[PDB]
């Protein structure tokens, strides 16, 4: 248990969109990690083609048991099927620190750009 920085410093969330291609990203500070299982994405006025969770590493904790985690950085590809103006994605996640610390869940809202269908 050492110097535990704020959640936004430990898990720097950001995103980038190019039409149907969206990328949710997290720069994960050395000594911190995110649980693959605790990531939830919820659409608002949009349809998700799919979410491609990358492969993470082996971790075992006393509660969730054997869980897959993410270190250094996480890029989460998310293809948008369709999205009208004002559409958004609510992304929730939870992480912790090797030095023995669990953070509360975090929630971010992602403003999507309109994207079409036929």
């Amino acid at each position: 248990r050492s110097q535990f920085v704020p959640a936004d410093q430990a898990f720097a969330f950001d995103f980038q969109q190019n039409q149907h291609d969206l990328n949710l990203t997290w720069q994960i500070k050395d000594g911190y990690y995110l649980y693959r299982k605790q990531i939830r994405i919820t659409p608002e006025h949009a349809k998700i083609a799919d979410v491609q969770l990358p492969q993470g590493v082996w971790h075992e904790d006393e509660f969730y048991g054997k869980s897959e985690i993410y270190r250094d950085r996480l890029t989460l590809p998310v293809t948008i099927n369709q999205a009208s103006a004002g559409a958004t994605l609510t992304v929730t996640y939870q992480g912790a620190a090797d030095a023995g610390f669990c953070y509360p869940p975090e929630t971010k809202t992602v403003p999507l750009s309109e994207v079409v269908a036929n």
Partner: protein
């Protein structure tokens, strides 16, 4: 007199706040569920804590010091795991869905063997509406809190008991002391030391701290 402060607090949606003296002239300490605030006696200005006394050798957190009474008022609700030969007493805000709170508890015998007594207070990092809170409420309501706590931590379920213990009180004190994650350790003097430490390192850290203070 205080009518000015309460008028201000009410008008801001913080009326159920507990008012106490502040070590600064013309200001009062305001305890709320989201943290401690300092407001002027005329209720015109507010500053969010904490407050530090930097006169002494090392700066002290007078906010957490003052909160020791709040902490002592909940001594009855704490799940205590006293060391046979008590050399130290630490207060721990724990969460049952936190792998590190588990790691810490699985080693209780070792903290105790080193003279470290642990007193637990609930702090569901997921909030007061999570399953973490319900479960812990159930634990803190059992006849034998220690065994219920042990069972749940070990994976066993517990009977949802109903009692006078409000996990909300624990949660609020925690936020007042600056607790954001779990587990978090509170020292005898109010100093917040976030995170888990193995028995040996905790023992050593506690010893070194006795000297720092004295």
């Amino acid at each position: 007199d205080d009518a000015a402060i309460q008028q201000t607090l009410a008008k801001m949606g913080i009326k159920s706040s507990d008012i106490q003296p502040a070590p600064v002239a013309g200001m009062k300490t305001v305890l709320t569920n989201s943290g401690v605030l300092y407001i002027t006696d005329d209720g015109k200005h507010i500053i969010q804590g904490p407050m530090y006394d930097v006169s002494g050798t090392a700066p002290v957190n007078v906010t957490n010091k003052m909160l020791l009474k709040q902490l002592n008022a909940l001594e009855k609700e704490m799940i205590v795991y006293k060391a046979p030969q008590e050399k130290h007493v630490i207060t721990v805000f724990t969460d049952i869905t936190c792998g590190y709170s588990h790691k810490l508890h699985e080693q209780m015998a070792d903290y105790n063997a080193l003279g470290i007594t642990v007193r637990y207070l609930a702090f569901p990092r997921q909030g007061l509406d999570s399953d973490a809170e319900k479960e812990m409420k159930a634990i803190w309501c059992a006849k034998d809190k220690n065994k219920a706590f042990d069972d749940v931590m070990a994976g066993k379920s517990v009977a949802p008991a109903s009692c006078d213990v409000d996990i909300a009180d624990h949660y609020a004190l925690g936020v007042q002391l600056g607790v954001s994650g779990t587990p978090a350790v509170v020292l005898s003097n109010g100093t917040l030391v976030p995170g888990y430490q193995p028995p040996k390192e905790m023992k050593e850290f506690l010893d070194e701290h006795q000297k720092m203070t004295s």
